[PDB]
Amino acid sequence: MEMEKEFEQIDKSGSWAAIYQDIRHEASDFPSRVAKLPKNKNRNRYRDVSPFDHSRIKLHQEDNDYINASLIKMEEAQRSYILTQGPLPNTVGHFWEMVWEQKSRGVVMLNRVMEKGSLKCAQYWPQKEEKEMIFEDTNLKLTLISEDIKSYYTVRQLELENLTTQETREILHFHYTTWPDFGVPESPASFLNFLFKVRESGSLSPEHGPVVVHCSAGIGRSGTFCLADTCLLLMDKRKDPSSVDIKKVLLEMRKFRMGLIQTADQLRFSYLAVIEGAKFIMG
Numbered sequence: 001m002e003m004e005k006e007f008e009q010i011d012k013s014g015s016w017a018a019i020y021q022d023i024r025h026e027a028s029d030f031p032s033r034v035a036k037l038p039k040n041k042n043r044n045r046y047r048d049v050s051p052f053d054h055s056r057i058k059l060h061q062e063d064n065d066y067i068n069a070s071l072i073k074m075e076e077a078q079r080s081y082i083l084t085q086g087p088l089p090n091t092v093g094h095f096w097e098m099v100w101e102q103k104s105r106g107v108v109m110l111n112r113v114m115e116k117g118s119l120k121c122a123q124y125w126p127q128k129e130e131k132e133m134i135f136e137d138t139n140l141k142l143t144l145i146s147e148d149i150k151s152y153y154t155v156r157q158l159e160l161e162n163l164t165t166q167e168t169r170e171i172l173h174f175h176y177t178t179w180p181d182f183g184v185p186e187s188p189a190s191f192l193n194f195l196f197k198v199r200e201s202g203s204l205s206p207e208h209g210p211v212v213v214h215c216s217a218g219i220g221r222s223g224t225f226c227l228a229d230t231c232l233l234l235m236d237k238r239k240d241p242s243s244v245d246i247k248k249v250l251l252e253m254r255k256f257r258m259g260l261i262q263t264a265d266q267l268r269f270s271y272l273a274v275i276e277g278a279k280f281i282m283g
């Protein structure tokens, strides 16, 4: 079925939970043996969210190459994303090592450091120009260059230096700051505006490594971001845009990381975002 009328049909019939449970039943199951080794316990935030072995990002290190991060490679859309958990106190150096090694231009952050009164990720970037951060375990230096605070999101320019080689690179930090502590946003308009700002920066384009996107676990809000982006790109590429099937795209993405889209409300919000976004792209 088309999307916008499939949407009203699920609303009128109140069957979002059943649609979402079907997706959960059909989703791929692949091994995640490296994630579950005892030496990696303090590298995972949640015991039930792990990268598959076949798609995990490897650190360029011979001691321990493990990080909780996955490569989502979308063949028809010609887009790739790295989805990862919010960094932990003992993995902030690994996080920036990955950014460096994978040649990423942008980092997309969809959570606040504190939500619901608890810490959802480490403070992994510097908050003042004159107070830079040094990660001694991976030999990197990180400096805040500029910060632009808007009503729904903040963009930061950061400098990452590899202290072994003295090479430097400019990284863009796109921080969506207004996702509610509970539930999903009422309108997708500010989320879509944010996605378009990430696109306009070059961070999603083939001349760079894959964008790094995270929330707390790296599957819920993060899944919504890449699902909406890929669906909208396919609608621009195909002769028949009404052939784009958001459930089929989601199941393809779940071949590369488990659990993408965590609730039926997040599924409905993803449909809403693609539907409204497709009208703005044209006219």
Ligand SMILES: Nc1ccccc1Nc1nc2ccccc2[nH]1
Residues within 6 Å of the ligand: 232, 235, 236, 237, 238, 239, 240, 241, 277, 278, 279, 281, 282
């Ligand atoms: N794909 C295509 C085929 C024929 C004519 C125009 C278009 N481009 C296009 N881009 C879209 C983005 C969202 C929704 C529909 C869209 N159609």
